[model samples]
Target chain A: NAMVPTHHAGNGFAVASEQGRICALAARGQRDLRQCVRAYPSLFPNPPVDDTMLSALALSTAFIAPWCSAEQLRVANRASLWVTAEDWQVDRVATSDDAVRSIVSACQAVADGAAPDVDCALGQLLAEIRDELATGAGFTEWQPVWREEVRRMLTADIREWEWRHSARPPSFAEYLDNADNYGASFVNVSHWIVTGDAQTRSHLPELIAASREVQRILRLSNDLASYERDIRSGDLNALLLVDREEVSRQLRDRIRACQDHLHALEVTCPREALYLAREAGFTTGFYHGA
Target chain B: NAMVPTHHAGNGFAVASEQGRICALAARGQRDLRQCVRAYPSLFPNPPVDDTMLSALALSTAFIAPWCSAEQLRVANRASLWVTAEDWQVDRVATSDDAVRSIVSACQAVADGAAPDVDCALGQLLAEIRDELATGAGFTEWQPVWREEVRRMLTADIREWEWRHSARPPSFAEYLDNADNYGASFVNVSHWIVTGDAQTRSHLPELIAASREVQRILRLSNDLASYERDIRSGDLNALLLVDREEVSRQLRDRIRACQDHLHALEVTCPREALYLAREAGFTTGFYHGA
Candidate 1:
């Protein structure tokens, strides 16, 4: 073997073993995400949100915030699964602009306190997510941030839906600005409003800003990785509007921009910043050609 | 005789009389805003934020939410005074872009929990506002919304400062998007966080959305009225970039837009809907020629 990467093999052994504890923990949460999504069976359909998607959704949340208990990460896990089912419904399955518009309207209604429509599967699942999050005793205080994030994510979806069907596509700047369509921040806000401490909660301006930046990064990296399938499926990709170099350049520039934001965020609100930074790092592994 | 607009002269008399209770209450609160501003003397020079400005600020809040006591509107009153002093410092007073940048940085520091620098009077007053709001029992939960509004207002100010000095002016769309510099919503956020009901507070997404629409109306109308003074002071008035017809047309459009938002907001969260709608109506009185 080359010069050892581990400083002390035995201590590293302790580190990797403890890390396995979270691996099992993430595994346990994945089971519940599977359980949660089963109730909304009509929304997920069969192949769109198969077992793999649900498994990765929970692992994504658990590994990013490894210290969180399984229950604490449940919102993130369930919400991420919710987001996955959402994209499949809107992006892959829905065939018409009107169908997409109708889907989003029901979500807006449910998020705003309307009971889920008996006929709408998306609304039912979303209302369940909203109800659970709102039931947290102190969550009403943090609801504005969450409610606003939902508005952002939904509007972004509608904008992207129009862009998909419209003859004239949006410019690169506008397309990238609609990154909230990716829905990471929506899930992130649900987790934060439920789990964050007083200081972390208060400083959400910076945290949310950083989340948007990370969202752009994730959106680009995701588009790049999935571009092949996107092309086959007629999904809009950054690569379709510009060259690979241009998209990658924007990705790297935003990476530096996010670094600047996270540095300050870490100073003001350290734990959430860690949550942010770790997720960005984790995305680098998951989204990149590993 | 024309139909009496008052419907019932005696009932209207009772209405106007109880409203006078708010007038006296508003008068009492103005005394405190004056008292509060005196603590930050260097931030408020004599002419820019004189006694009249403080009086009008408190009166604006009290009359709009007449049912609230003087103590309840205290944050809005003082915060409006603070916004008045801030504009005087940055727009009319500061000589350089770097100076404006420095002022904004110190404010960000204080808002993020930094102690105000002994030498920075602006930082001192803002920190006091942050401290008072943070001290409220349930306020930590609502602090993110407040914190984000402050960020929006500050960034809008900086953008305007750059636009004022830049050789190539921004498009009307871009300049209008920077309307947060007016700081109306910042003061509104302060008031609602401290004073709104549980239902009203939790549903802040719509409430805040309607507030932004109302701010646009207040902004454009204020710009139209102050165009004369604005031209004299080198401030960026909408009329400078666009014609009167265009600006007036945009104003009418947004007024209709605000009506649309308020209708829905009233249905979802009623009292703050009244707060928002009354403020827009109050702004019409305060800003228009009537």
Candidate 2:
């Protein structure tokens, strides 16, 4: 009962259930957060996130969803898992063109509303994502937007893959232009699919802009925190492209931008704005902690 | 005789003499581009420039100055070597805080119009740069501007060192904002010191903007070509921060900006504008070759 507190209208059960599904999926994917370091062995050589962190992340997403149903929480967790898994592959295992191709294919399958044939965790996660969206309200109308975002995300990944193989680092301007698309835009879009009210959906353009600002804040913060590990792993990091002082300066600018967007949202659509502000706060805190 | 082409005026001896000094300085620094790979075996593990390339670089700078004296060419070459040496150290060997301190000290000495005490290549280069500017026609008036530009360059380097040590990369916007200061701004300033006519000096503001655009083009082009090598060496390259397509796109934008600046110059001061346009074209071709 303590674990299922009555805070926020007893949606604690939904949050707990979502947390349970996240753990189950992580276990099935061999990335079970319960075992701490024993999750995937070499798969996460420099694990950016562990079980506790994963649980915390899932919980954070659920924390913002007091009104969401258990089914909604479960779907959101699955989408979160898909993003986490993709990060793992791109950051650690996927090196060659062939490895990148496999990921691209899996993402394409999910975007096309079909289950990927690959018998992997990513494929399963994508299949679940497709299934969840298919049954969601206004599925037909939302599907295209969802697919386009996914396509953009995958395209950014493929570009990164090519750079990794070719051993090319991108310019800072170019990186900023793509960071939101590559980092958290798709994930945010997925979250909206479940939680977006009619007002939010009606104001899609504003929401999209707000979400992008949030992702920029998150992506930059993540890069700042993970640059050391990233450099050691030979992963491309934004910190590598310019000076740290500039990074600090830009982080402030992005934070301001996020706040401005949040203010606009608050004025136009209070509920949606509140949700985005919470997500931004959570993202900033998570990366800061990392 | 071939070394001193009489294409513009009787400044052949100055050009030929400057070429000899460059080689002599390189030898003294033990980074003699002449021996090809023998200078610093581990220093330049992936030598970006050979003797021919170095000669081509110096010659390209001299090409803009058929009117400049041999002393002018020698001074420009010294400045070029200083920039190149700084690049190599930051990109390769320097890691510890001490390494960065040494560089900061050298730049500070140059800014203060004093010779750095250190008996290294960078120190010697700084000394030469100071000596050349000290005796120039507009030394007193130009000294502060020169110092400020050098300070900006060194500050950017210090920022890079901090980022490298901290393992943080900057966002693309931040990178672009600082790229000009970090990359070719100093070199462009050096060229201006030796070659700026009365008309050019009078139009300092316009000239600086035009030169900055030229430097931007050169910097981006350098990043595109050298990204592979930079990645292998664990050196930060702008190309790694973004997509290749994006780099190409930005390159075009920088080119257009440079042209606009040149057009503005052409209207205000045709002679100075033509000189800058030529220099810009040469810089573009040099990096393209690389």
Candidate 3:
């Protein structure tokens, strides 16, 4: 189930954890993503949700979910919907600044526990996720970090709108900085929220850095693959601003950087490294079409 | 000549230092920006450079130029061209990733002192600026900081590209983050470069923060005034993303924040605060129509 291990730590433990997360979700008889989508009709209103997007979301969290409980999986699943929905709105619906701010205010209010005046679907989902996080393990201590990450993600989304409105593209370094923040690293962080493993928490600094590298890899790779589509949609892709060859070269460098980072962590934080590497491997394949 | 003083230290000494920098620049008989633009035919290229753009650039540097020497002013003028030219390319000409990468590579080469293969205009200008900084006062110790700031500015520019390609708008927070980096704070930093004042350098941290506030005020105020034009150009403006009324509210809040930050600094670093406040005050009038 896991990609061939690229390190001495190998595939066995990594693959097991990957399967373990899946198994744990199954053992709890948690609702499938489709079922979850159906249950939150407001959140996923348009039926026939894109299977590819749902699969990608599921895959993003697979590495870390094994360490989480059934409750965590449920929350994770809902949070995935929140993320995807927000992305869809920003990309497809919220074209004007006013529309975007309305959405932002709603999400901010929900996160702040103030009832949003508009009761936006996205806000409702965020409110529910906020509650799940509050009762989840380690919420008390990690709440600030989680909130800050969400804020960062939302802020990045707004930045993207400004770029599109202006038809300007950022340089590679700038793209990487914002991309690392908004590139679904939060999904990985959510796993920690659920598991609340002290050992994992203690390694937070390195883990966070590793997670950002994973995000950078995945985000760049995904942008590369989606370049044509994004261009057609008028969506910003770094591939649109830099030479394709240069981007490919950068991608290869990042992959190596990520591998080296994970390898260094393997000796001391074996499980954590395995989980991160597994996710990184998945992101690599998605981008590389392996 | 300066904002009404709000601190116990008052404005007597601060106003003198402010005058001192201006007097020094004038004493050297530096060529006005227009003459400099005329001399660099290769850099400015087109005859009849837009008066408005030239005026804006001059205004941007006015607050700090007093602290610079004739040699420094020459460098500053060329650097301004570099900045504006790069911005124009990213926004108008270099729509493709390859084009932007070529531009970025050339600038990076110039910054790195590597022989640029292309010898592009932007690259040439950057090289001149680099040499200026190398020989300029305090440059040996501060070159790294200057380069890093430029990188941050370039990175922010790239982020703008990504947003344009995707048609996504950044939230106010995100916009502020990148804006702080890219909004011509280099003009402020230039003051320190020329003076190399140890006491000023000692308070660098707070000064940097103050510089950012000035940047934020100017960027937002500029965006507000340019809203209609930006909308017509399909350029991203924060005023375009948030509710017009809401943005106006936020602008007021930011103005107050800028004032408060400047006020707090006045007592401890009066001259620096005066310089920053003068810029901030100019920005406020430019936006608010004082």
Candidate 4:
């Protein structure tokens, strides 16, 4: 079933538990994304729904806009899955820089209003996402923005892939700047376009400005927590450039900055602002252990 | 003398020229700032404001908001002067790290609503600027936003000073990230608070976000133009960490990112957005010649 309750049904605190509160809101989204991915099995290439990574992806957007229905979050859920699947291809599956370039170019072509090749699962999924977002009230107004962030996310991802095998290692600033590789901001613009209210839509640009800063902090936290795992997998983590202590210090600096951006955004987009804060808050904690 | 026209009010093309348009709009603000500095000589400590540096400073704001009168830009003019003087004090007058801290601390305390120390020229000037801004129509609404940008500007400035003399130099990323030390963003907030209309005021946060990106470009332009001067003066420059080619590449990267930010902001604040673009445009050209 696409909908499930959070926790065992009988636990006393289940109704009030933080995870229950968030997970229940996200449960249906998780299931839907899982099923959606399975429908395009070659693209997903993994267990359809049982993937913990997939579950967290849906919950990230689900908890941010709990007022949104599972259906409203469809684009966000699917976009998040696409980013993961894309990243997996770029990070682990691609055999060379040329292969990565082709992957990025295919998505970019489809995102720019071209028809997706029927056989290419990634392009097909992206085309589906763009079409759904176009159904929103203001998609015509926001499509350029949606398309550009898509370009940025894919561009940065390809850059990171190239940086991994290239002669030039990126400086700390250069690497952190490629936070677009996190793909969160693209997901953010997608969520807002598909599901945003009047206030959220009007303030889309500011909310997006806030989202990019938040994305940087999440990038830092991810690298920090995944330092060892990234090394084992031959990936480029922040720890590869700076010491752990310095990375932690930089994290604090970035977090303070993100907080300021969110605070300013609160006046115009309070709910979306809190969603950003809560999402960052929730995601950062998970990095500590996972 | 304070009301003298641009290009000696001669040369037929002068009135129609770009410099004429901006310099004429800014000329009066320059005079007023110069005279204001002289009125408090201990605070200004130099030739009131005949400094070409001071002249360019006024034009930065004057050209950006040409629609506003000289009177309307009083806070911006004063704040810009304060930044130059404050930077000077920190850069040259201070003999010890403790002295730099005192300079930053005093201005910050005054900005936060404490009375300026009568003996401190920087603090006194800042207090004067703050009082004028509070007279704006919506100061109460935007005070926190204004104040926080002030804190960021100073905090980053102080951090830069510390970095200059510290055992560890900042990474290139850390250095560019500290572009708040440039003080342009603070002046931007001050300008809007004092003279912004409803559209401008309501969109202040987004404008401010866009301004910060613009400020980074300005910082890069400054360093790139002043590389040799900074080297001679033993001050830090981006080229000191990264090569000229890389700095140029990073400059292009920052400029493109800034363009995207301004494009989004233009939808809501076109006039203000033009001001930002033109300011960077004018200033970057000057850097090439200087």
C-alpha TM-score for every candidate: 0.48, 0.42, 0.44, 0.47
**Alpha-carbon error at A180 in model 1, in Å?**
71
Query: Which candidate wins on TM-score?
Result: 1
TM-score of chain B of 1: 0.92
Please identify which of the two predictions, 2 or 3, would achieve the higher lDDT against the true structure. Answer: 3
Best by the lDDT measure:
1
Cα lDDT of model 1 by residue, B31-74, tens digit: 67878877888777776666445645665676577667777777
lDDT of 2 by residue, B1-290 (tens): 66952232112212222323322232232233333234333333445754434544444544444345445556555566667667777656676788877877776785686766655656656666677676663423666667767887778777766755565788766676666444465766666666665665667766777666666666677788788877886656777689889988998877767666666557676545555665655455445531
Give one clash count per candidate, in the order shown. 0, 19, 36, 1
Model 2's alpha-carbon lDDT is: 0.60
Q: Residue A133 deviation, candidate 3, in Å?
A: 1.4
Model 2: per-residue Cα lDDT over A138-197, one tens digit each? 423677777877887788877776666675678987777676444466776776776665
Least accurate stretch of 10 residues (summed lDDT) in model 1 chain B?
B6-15
Candidate 3 deviant stretches above 4 angstroms: A1-32, A45-56, A63-71, A116-118, A180-183, B1-290
CA error at residue B262 for candidate 2, angstroms: 72
Q: Name model 2 segments beyond 4 Å from true.
A: A1-50, A63-71, A118-120, A138-140, B1-290
The residue pairs found clashing in candidate 4 are A173-B173
lDDT (Cα, tens digit) per residue for candidate 4, span B44-118: 655534454455566556655656778888888888888878888888788897898888888878988999987
Candidate lDDT values, in order? 0.73, 0.60, 0.62, 0.73
Chain B vs. true chain B: TM-score for each candidate? Answer: 0.92, 0.76, 0.79, 0.88
Estimate the TM-score for candidate 1.
0.48
The full ranking of all candidates by lDDT, starting with the best, is 1, 4, 3, 2
